[PDB]
Design a protein around this ligand. Structure first.
Ligand SMILES: CC(C)CCC[C@@H](C)[C@H]1CC[C@H]2[C@@H]3CC=C4C[C@@H](OC(=O)CCC(=O)O)CC[C@]4(C)[C@H]3CC[C@]12C
Ligand SMILES: CC(C)CCC[C@@H](C)[C@H]1CC[C@H]2[C@@H]3CC=C4C[C@@H](OC(=O)CCC(=O)O)CC[C@]4(C)[C@H]3CC[C@]12C
Ligand SMILES: CC(C)CCC[C@@H](C)[C@H]1CC[C@H]2[C@@H]3CC=C4C[C@@H](OC(=O)CCC(=O)O)CC[C@]4(C)[C@H]3CC[C@]12C
Ligand SMILES: CC(C)CCC[C@@H](C)[C@H]1CC[C@H]2[C@@H]3CC=C4C[C@@H](OC(=O)CCC(=O)O)CC[C@]4(C)[C@H]3CC[C@]12C
Ligand SMILES: Nc1nc2c(ncn2[C@@H]2O[C@H](COP(=O)(O)OP(=O)(O)O)[C@@H](O)[C@H]2O)c(=O)[nH]1
Ligand SMILES: Nc1nc2c(ncn2[C@@H]2O[C@H](COP(=O)(O)OP(=O)(O)O)[C@@H](O)[C@H]2O)c(=O)[nH]1
Ligand SMILES: Nc1nc2c(ncn2[C@@H]2O[C@H](COP(=O)(O)OP(=O)(O)O)[C@@H](O)[C@H]2O)c(=O)[nH]1
Ligand SMILES: O=C(NNc1ccccc1Cl)[C@]12C[C@H]3C[C@H](C[C@H](C3)C1)C2
Ligand SMILES: O=C(NNc1ccccc1Cl)[C@]12C[C@H]3C[C@H](C[C@H](C3)C1)C2
Ligand SMILES: O=C(NNc1ccccc1Cl)[C@]12C[C@H]3C[C@H](C[C@H](C3)C1)C2
Ligand SMILES: *[C@@H]1O[C@H](CO)[C@@H](O)[C@H](O)[C@H]1NC(C)=O
Ligand SMILES: *[C@@H]1O[C@H](CO)[C@@H](O)[C@H](O)[C@H]1NC(C)=O
Ligand SMILES: *[C@@H]1O[C@H](CO)[C@@H](O)[C@H](O)[C@H]1NC(C)=O
Ligand SMILES: *[C@@H]1O[C@H](CO)[C@@H](O)[C@H](O)[C@H]1NC(C)=O
Ligand SMILES: *[C@@H]1O[C@H](CO)[C@@H](O)[C@H](O)[C@H]1NC(C)=O
Ligand SMILES: *[C@@H]1O[C@H](CO)[C@@H](O)[C@H](O)[C@H]1NC(C)=O
Ligand SMILES: *[C@@H]1O[C@H](CO)[C@@H](O)[C@H](O)[C@H]1NC(C)=O
Ligand SMILES: *[C@@H]1O[C@H](CO)[C@@H](O)[C@H](O)[C@H]1NC(C)=O
Ligand SMILES: *[C@@H]1O[C@H](CO)[C@@H](O)[C@H](O)[C@H]1NC(C)=O
Ligand SMILES: [Zn+2]
Ligand SMILES: [Zn+2]
Ligand SMILES: [Zn+2]
Ligand SMILES: [Zn+2]
Ligand SMILES: [Zn+2]
Ligand SMILES: [Zn+2]
Lengths: 542, 542, 542
């Protein structure tokens, strides 16, 4: 069946010369194409995108003169306020509280409404209060003279309950600078670059307009970019995020991979002591004095700077473009769908019985009846119960698609399709000579109301009973045809049924399932009788 | 050609009134639509998704009483067991081994099966053993009395080969808490939020059911969530991961962005000393005594906690929805594809010659023959070798789509299509008077087996030779038509060929490529001869 | 209207038995299918992919003998050159400069072209020079004998301006090893694994061919992999990245999740002192001597190693496959689109008037005229101005789709379609007896140039004026039909218009909008006159 392989099925189409429908089609196509191109270009859907692999290296710079009422002036440098960047973050100490000479011993705990005692009964041995850095020994002792407080085993003397200094000791930390070196890679695209390129000015400091590509940031500038007071956030500390966004196109014609610097405060501006506002931690400087292990505890407050590097690098990928085009292809059939919907809707008689009289504007849309008739063809399932009846008086045909069960087809009305016995209205029918189960089918008249019969019509005699015509029809199909007398009569009788059905019902779709009236049936049978036997009747083709 | 632009091609369609096929179509459509909607909703394919940009800040809390057999009790606080979170991780020391008063000197290395010597020959000067922290000087000396061990230059005294203390010195570290503050951003969606919201209870501790949004975690609770013993993992250490998952919908109607906390052990539970089980490191406390640079070495064991923050934030995007709909649109033609497949398959005669007799269930599916005939029209390539022959005796036509090369078309049988000379079976043919290369074409008879001729048929004389009919056919196309005698004969002869071909082959598709038999051809030529010259014969239209 | 629901519209198609077009269709289909399968397989578009969640744990190993000209030999171990991995990075000190015994005091700043003074006027009190670690007191003092330099408040003595030692003190750091343990998770796929599996050899060191899965890396090996000198990068320092790529398939049949190790230098190989080449930082060792707070400052140079873990884990997802198939489905209609384009193009007369004479190769493609005629049907908008005129002399018909406004239709020529009064060319027409606004329509002749009339044609009399024929046509539609005399004449006259229009214009599409010539119109009206009144004329069906 190689010939079956080498076959191409092309749809049958109707081409309409309509201003409106062609204009609609082209408008739809232009709009769809424009949106598809716009989406492709704007979202770069032709590109395979890869997240950035980043490495950050910071260099902080600046010294601070610190005033401490002990008054003494001291200079702090990088070794004293910062530690090298770890995990894309660096910390600059802005403030501190110091507690010198701590030994692991037993000491009276610093007085507070909790630790104040009036007798030994107010303390419990081994009690770990969450707001304490020690474990009670059960007895309370003098802190300073009159005042009695719970004794604890801990690093002693205990820290004073004091607030962070105001102003911050390292308030000059706003004039410090940080140089950020950012290296990025797209391993899939095998593209690595960096934020500092040859020819970049190193004598600059970042400004979002003047110097938007300078990687040297003054911390005060950052805070101002974000809308915060460095002098205030310095007192208790904070977290600031330096976002480096990489929107990179790796196509060599449209190549562009530069960073965009932005800033965002990352700590909640909470004043709730319960939530530990700011950013601080306790750091121990261990040492030895007089063979005793001692500790200087610094409560460090500062600002942690987080370098948040994110972005994508895109490069043209054939497969992504293919996928996007394939997804968008089906949107070009919507013009056809919409116009076919219009043709189907405006083909309904409802749109002229009611709609047009009200809205006369839509009257010219009646042409869609022509488009529908030239577009759609309707066919019914050729079931064995399917039947068609035509009445000469009536101006149409009836599709009786229901079982005739003890009910004459004359009285069994069905759906409306366009082009002596009690049930007889022409006076030329005979009772059905067939099984009473199916007699009702053959109990049909040429008409619904009394009057003349259609077997009297002069056309019937010449379009159904004319022997010359029927024999010529037989010869047309079979030029050299010879038959017995009975065979000739049978061939003629079947041709007569065929010709009547074609005459009254037209198309062969309805003439195959047509039903002849009893009058015409028996007239034809009389004209072309059979030698012996009984006539079978109607037989459904399928 | 503006009119050519303003054209709409609509497919010709056949509408079938079938219960089965309409039900199948609507079932397919409902299922496809339901699945498309389900996928869109479940995977939120209408949303553009953006990975989370996270910042974590931890605050650990708790003190531990530590027993060391030197027995001495000591209190450890945050300054003694933890360092501020770096890179989304914090470390809590749970155990330690201490080696005090180390000087860079020469010392006997701690005894092991490796370092035990019996003479100086067992050591090599400058030898860096991987299991050693020193470099041999070549000579071995007394470690403690009788026992001789390799001498090394190193920090001395060398560490003892001892196991981590059991129980862990800071085993109370399970009662410590950590408050995690997590800030997240979606820069593309310009949406930042945090894990602690106003009105959240700070007096809580996390419980996956009671307190699933409390960011205060007791370390023992974490280990239990994961199914581990804090007391065991404390001895040698470990790594625990605190996963914060953000499934965030940023649509204001369906907005939801809260974290989901989970826990996962991140260290292999390996007991293989070769793989360095646990988590430990050697930390040096440098100091000065007697103007000598000394070191206290602590082998620190603890649990490193990694805060693993991941997730996506989605917001409705028009383009993503368009793409998804476009991808899913083509699935609505599968009903048509499947039903057309059914109509094509059940139209085959194979499905009734064999299938129906066996499986009588499928007999009612014969109606698809009607659907096929009303659906598909078949046409062959009008090649110059294409030819059609009809034999009056035969009940069909033959498509001889092959070159007749010295072989009379009578004997050259081809494919089966439905509706005196040695090769003559009617006794009314003449030899072909044309080039012998193509004579074989015109060497055709009206029939395949002996008998009468079809030129004798009464229809032929009236449908091919009747001058009145032919002149009327000519006049129909050309009402006022006048011709010369020879021109009249030629017009009539061609009309006779046309009418015979239409009579026997029917459609003009087959009548254009039809071939008249020699008998009929020469009868027609005799009826309508030409004044002079020889008859050309058949000429392929294409 | 449940029957309307139970309807299936199937496209009418034409099946072509062409070698070329079937071969083209199957070639297109095979190519499209092959590419779709290839893209699906290669990009694993059936898979849902999830980024990796990673945790890294390093263990560095090795000791270094360090020579310092003070010459003194010292051994450095892990406690002396590295700190535990923080944020997926570890640092190994390779070199250092030491400045012992620093006190916060006033000191002469180290001499440079900047700090050299000749008098007190060269210094400004409180001046913070960016290249200084102190704040000037306004006066300059002796540094060493003759040489005078600006005095500053700072940690003193000030650091010497000296270069990093050559060779690096810890140049043996290339023989150090690092064991990397990498744990990964795909939470969506609920799949966690690790880079070290049971049965892996721990006595190995990484080699990209011999030992590609060993997680023990010698730092010198890394530098060589990247193409760098450890001895040079050690002097000032650097950043090296150890990339661990995870291309993981989580399908149990095709499961594979192993790491791929690669190396990349992450620091710019810049020699520009202005950009701070290398990797170094200043670290303070604080201590106490004689109750004085002192500092040993180490300028640390080393190599920071960044463990860069990236990758995706994919697992089969039904929805992704559905989406991809839906996107690719519309590419299977391109064969139809292309072949229909060919059939439309090769159907044009332009392709035979010009193209074929030049390029005779393309002559056999004329069959596409047959394919077009059997494929496309063209229909015009049935506007009320649409009209068709046929002239017996002419060999075609004219579609006059324009308003006849005071211009006889005889002289109003329109588009070309295939099959006594001054404007009369047959001598058998009469002036139009209708409103002069529309008389011009009825002012049409049977012909364009002088001669006989078509009302004289014998067919016209029998195909338009034969009463027997017309009454038979009426009876065919209405077998039993009785009419009044005037009604009979009207029915016959309209049937005559219908039959002439069908005879001359053929299809009813053109015969509904046909216009009869004045001669034929008035001949028919004379044959079948009306009892009283005036004839209305032509009426557009739509
Ligand atoms: C939206 C639909 C209906 C129309 C499809 C349009 C395409 C023809 C466009 C879309 C994306 C375009 C591509 C976008 C990017 C590139 C990369 C460009 O190459 C480079 O810039 C790098 C050169 C190199 O090193 O290869 C060459 C053109 C090309 C392939 C373009 C060719 C034209 C493409 C395929
Ligand atoms: C064509 C006619 C016959 C029916 C058309 C119905 C659809 C257009 C409806 C049915 C189901 C609807 C969806 C039902 C559920 C959702 C999820 C909803 O999002 C959520 O519920 C978010 C929940 C979360 O974040 O957890 C957004 C709208 C959407 C997509 C709805 C959009 C409109 C849909 C597709
Ligand atoms: C699956 C196919 C065959 C049917 C397509 C269904 C759509 C009509 C649905 C799917 C997703 C829906 C959208 C999902 C989310 C939103 C956001 C919603 O807006 C918000 O919640 C935020 C309001 C704001 O600030 O803009 C308004 C409805 C809308 C656009 C929905 C409108 C209805 C949509 C487009
Ligand atoms: C490209 C278009 C035109 C054709 C579509 C081809 C499909 C039929 C292929 C593509 C991907 C295939 C799937 C790829 C992966 C798997 C996983 C496999 O399961 C496992 O390996 C894990 C078993 C388990 O635990 O479930 C079973 C086969 C299956 C579903 C395959 C079935 C066949 C699929 C759906
Ligand atoms: N369409 C149609 N066909 C009929 C009808 N009655 C009989 N026939 C056809 O005529 C044939 C039976 O003819 P019948 O009168 O029984 O003559 P007999 O079969 O030789 O005895 C069947 O094949 C039917 O298809 C009818 O009412 N309508
Ligand atoms: N279909 C068909 N057409 C034929 C055949 N023989 C001749 N013709 C047509 O008749 C014409 C030639 O007629 P011919 O007998 O040669 O008369 P002449 O051409 O005037 O000498 C050609 O245009 C053919 O299309 C035939 O066997 N089959
Ligand atoms: N196609 C076509 N139809 C016509 C023409 N003239 C008249 N008719 C039809 O004939 C009918 C009018 O016939 P007419 O001669 O006026 O007789 P009357 O209407 O009874 O007076 C209308 O319904 C028209 O459709 C014509 O030139 N072309
Ligand atoms: O000790 C430090 N600074 N010195 C310092 C601190 C307070 C008061 C005086 C001094 Cl001289 C640190 C140690 C550690 C944590 C924090 C930042 C750096 C690394 C430097 C504080
Ligand atoms: O020295 C520390 N704790 N003190 C300590 C340790 C062992 C024994 C006694 C004491 Cl008093 C460290 C230093 C460094 C690493 C590790 C965690 C913190 C930062 C605190 C240990
Ligand atoms: O002091 C250290 N090493 N010792 C050291 C350094 C220079 C000279 C001699 C010595 Cl004995 C550090 C402290 C800090 C930063 C850097 C790496 C490690 C953690 C070890 C240097
Ligand atoms: C920052 O530096 C400027 C000098 O440009 C100085 O005027 C200002 O006081 C400094 N700010 C702080 C907080 O030290
Ligand atoms: C840019 O570089 C020049 C030297 O090439 C320098 O003088 C100038 O200050 C730099 N730009 C800024 C804003 O300082
Ligand atoms: C900034 O903070 C300081 C210290 O808290 C305060 O004195 C000052 O008024 C604040 N001003 C601004 C600009 O917020
Ligand atoms: C944890 O605290 C509880 C008190 O609630 C105490 O009973 C228990 O012993 C503690 N565990 C450790 C290991 O210290
Ligand atoms: C919730 O807050 C209340 C005070 O508002 C507090 O009493 C209660 O303890 C908190 N919840 C828990 C579980 O402790
Ligand atoms: C937990 O660990 C401790 C110390 O190793 C051990 O004594 C105890 O039996 C362990 N029990 C559990 C619950 O695993
Ligand atoms: C590295 O170790 C080898 C011994 O295998 C030794 O020969 C070499 O000198 C060492 N390199 C350095 C820089 O110490
Ligand atoms: C592999 O393991 C064996 C012991 O099982 C060991 O002898 C060998 O050295 C290892 N491989 C290498 C390359 O060392
Ligand atoms: C490597 O670096 C050292 C120190 O700078 C230098 O002496 C040597 O020549 C360099 N050689 C190579 C292989 O680059
Ligand atoms: Zn009757
Ligand atoms: Zn009757
Ligand atoms: Zn013959
Ligand atoms: Zn013959
Ligand atoms: Zn005229
Ligand atoms: Zn005329």
């Amino acid at each position: 069946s190689c010939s079956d392989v080498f076959q191409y099925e092309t749809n049958k189409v109707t081409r309409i010369q309509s201003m409106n429908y062609g204009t609609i089609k082209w408008f739809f196509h232009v709009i769809i194409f424009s949106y598809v191109c716009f989406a492709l270009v704007s979202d770069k859907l032709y590109q395979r995108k890869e997240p950035v692999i980043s490495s950050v290296h910071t260099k902080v710079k600046g010294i601070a003169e610190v005033k401490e009422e002990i008054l003494v002036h001291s200079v702090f440098d990088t070794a004293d306020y910062t530690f090298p960047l770890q995990g894309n973050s660096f910390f600059v100490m802005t403030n501190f509280l110091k507690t010198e000479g701590q030994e692991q011993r037993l000491c009276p705990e610093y007085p507070t409404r909790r630790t104040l005692c009036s007798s030994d009964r107010g303390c419990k041995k081994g009690w770990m209060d969450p707001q304490s850095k020690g474990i009670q020994t059960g007895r309370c002792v003098v802190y300073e003279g009159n005042q009695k407080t719970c004794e604890v085993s801990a690093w002693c003397p205990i820290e004073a309950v004091e607030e962070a200094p105001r102003p911050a000791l390292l308030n000059s930390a706003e004039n410090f600078t940080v140089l950020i070196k950012n290296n990025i890679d797209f391993p899939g695209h095998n593209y690595t670059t960096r934020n500092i390129l040859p020819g970049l000015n190193i004598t600059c400091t970042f400004h979002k307009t003047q110097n938007p590509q300078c990687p040297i940031f003054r911390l005060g500038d950052i805070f101002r970019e974000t809308g915060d007071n460095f002098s205030d956030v310095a007192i208790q500390g904070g977290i600031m995020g330096i976002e480096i966004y990489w929107d990179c196109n790796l196509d060599r014609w449209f190549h562009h991979c530069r960073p965009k610097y932005s800033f965002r405060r990352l700590d909640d501006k909470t004043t709730n002591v319960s939530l530990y506002p700011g950013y601080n931690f306790r750091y121990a400087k261990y040492y030895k004095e007089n063979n005793v292990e001692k500790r200087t505890l610094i409560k460090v407050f500062g600002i942690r700077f987080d370098i948040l590097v994110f972005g994508t690098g895109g490069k043209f990928d054939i497969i992504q473009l293919v996928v996007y085009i394939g997804s968008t292809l089906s949107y070009f059939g919507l013009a056809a769908v919409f116009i076919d919907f219009l043709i189907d809707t405006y083909s309904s008689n409802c749109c002229r019985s009611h709609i047009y009289p009200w809205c006369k504007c839509c009257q010219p849309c009646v042409v869609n009846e022509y488009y529908y008739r030239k577009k759609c063809e309707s066919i019914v399932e050729p079931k064995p119960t399917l039947k068609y009846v035509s009445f000469v008086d009536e101006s149409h045909i009836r599709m009786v698609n229901q079982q005739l069960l003890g009910r004459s087809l004359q009285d069994v009305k069905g759906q409306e399709v366009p082009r002596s016995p009690v049930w007889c209205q022409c006076g030329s029918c005979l009772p059905s000579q067939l099984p009473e189960s199916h007699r009702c089918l053959e109990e049909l008249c040429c008409r619904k109301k009394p009057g003349a019969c259609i077997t009297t019509s002069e056309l019937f005699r010449k379009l159904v009973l004319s022997r010359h015509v029927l024999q010529f029809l037989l010869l047309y199909q079979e030029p050299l045809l010879a038959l017995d007398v009975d065979s000739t009569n049978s061939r003629l009788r079947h041709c007569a049924y065929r010709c009547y059905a074609t005459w009254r019902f037209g198309s062969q779709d309805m003439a195959d399932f047509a039903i002849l009236p009893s009058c015409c049936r028996w007239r034809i049978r009389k004209e072309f009788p059979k030698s012996e036997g009984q006539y079978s009747g109607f037989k459904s083709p399928y």
